[PDB]
């Protein structure tokens, strides 16, 4: 299912600060940036990497929660739905 995506304004800076660059990326590229972004900003339970702490950062606002599990792609997809600008309908 992994399709191509396009990081908007507030979405580009996210991947950029994570070592990304450009205006085109797939689900695999984005997913890889997400993790790196969180680790770069330090928004997770060092004791449990599987437990992310969105707190109130960019990701926190986009999702609208407090924390989300990494090993559980539940809220991640729900947010990406309208967050990850995908193409091909």
């Amino acid at each position: 299912q992994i399709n191509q995506v396009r990081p908007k304004l507030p979405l580009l800076k996210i991947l950029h600060a994570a070592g990304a660059q450009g205006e085109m990326f797939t689900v695999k590229e984005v997913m890889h940036y997400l993790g790196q972004y969180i680790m770069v900003k330090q928004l997770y339970d060092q004791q449990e990497q599987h437990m992310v702490y969105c707190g109130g950062d960019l990701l926190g606002e986009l999702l609208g929660r407090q924390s989300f599990s990494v090993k559980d792609p539940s809220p991640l997809y729900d947010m990406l739905r309208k967050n990850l600008v995908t193409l091909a309908t």
Binding site: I2, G35, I38, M39, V70, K71, P73
Partner: peptide, 15 residues
């Protein structure tokens, strides 16, 4: 040798 987020993160089925 390195795992960290990569260990679990990877799990996330992009598909």
């Amino acid at each position: 040798s390195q795992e960290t987020f990569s260990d679990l993160w990877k799990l996330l089925p992009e598909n």
